[PDB]
Amino acid sequence: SHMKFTVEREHLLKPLQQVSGPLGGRPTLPILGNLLLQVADGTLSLTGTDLEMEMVARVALVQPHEPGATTVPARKFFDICRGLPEGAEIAVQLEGERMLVRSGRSRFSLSTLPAADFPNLDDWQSEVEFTLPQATMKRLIEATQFSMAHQDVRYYLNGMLFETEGEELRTVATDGHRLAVCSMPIGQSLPSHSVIVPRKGVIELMRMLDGGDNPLRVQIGSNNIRAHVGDFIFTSKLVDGRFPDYRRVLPKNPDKHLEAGCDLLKQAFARAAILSNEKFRGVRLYVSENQLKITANNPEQEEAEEILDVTYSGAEMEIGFNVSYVLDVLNALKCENVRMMLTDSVSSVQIEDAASQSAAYVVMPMRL
């Protein structure tokens, strides 16, 4: 019960920033504003939690140390370490109910809360395990994250589906108006499993991926997911509900195919958006032979019209959309050409990269 360690500032900074990720909101329980510090046999462990998830960093201690644990205010501790000079050695020790931080002739005495009071997620068992490059996991999350709901009463929508099938890992996100689905080959035969990760956990997991060559190891339990990246361990509770099935959301036979440049389509929708209704964001699309016309109007009777040359041979049709949902998709599709697959005025549209079927996007129209 006399915790003590000495570590170089540059070995402490990234782990402090990382474990602090889950902290921030309305700080209800005081100890949730603190990081748990634990010294044991050559390792300093730092933990941050919001009760739903936890982020752990392990720092190898190359200098003498004494075992123990305490919790210290996260922001104050991080700001102290970040404020010290490049190359500073940071000596930390518990002294009664205070944690001391010393470096050069700089001395800081921080208040603490007992390590025994720090909340831990209940012990659990892994059912699924696989490793993948960080860049693959980043691509999966980034291709769909924007389609998650925020605060929907259907709580299973305020998160992201993580699904293993055959040799692929898939992400699905939907808010009841639009849906995004992406799948990537993992190169390992996998059991079939589907879990919902809470949206705050998705964002945190996204934050811990530096795209770097350190591989990502995932472990999935019945009520938890865990990701190991280098010296970091992220664990989150899962969302217990029935996620929608993308296979049933994808338009059955979208016979009308339109092809156009992704940037040209995105810029035309972005200019039309300026004169759309600020609340409803409605745009009107008219498709005719090798032409798309985008129109927007607002309550001041202001109007935007964009005419584009496209590839289209189907029947003429009119269809309305929330322009932010369309722009979100085009922004996520970082490609040269896009394909929009239409049915009729009252049916969803499927949008994808004309050169790749790895991701698919489904947008429900608006009544014109």
Partner: peptide
Amino acid sequence: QADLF
């Protein structure tokens, strides 16, 4: 806005 499901 129409519902997707």
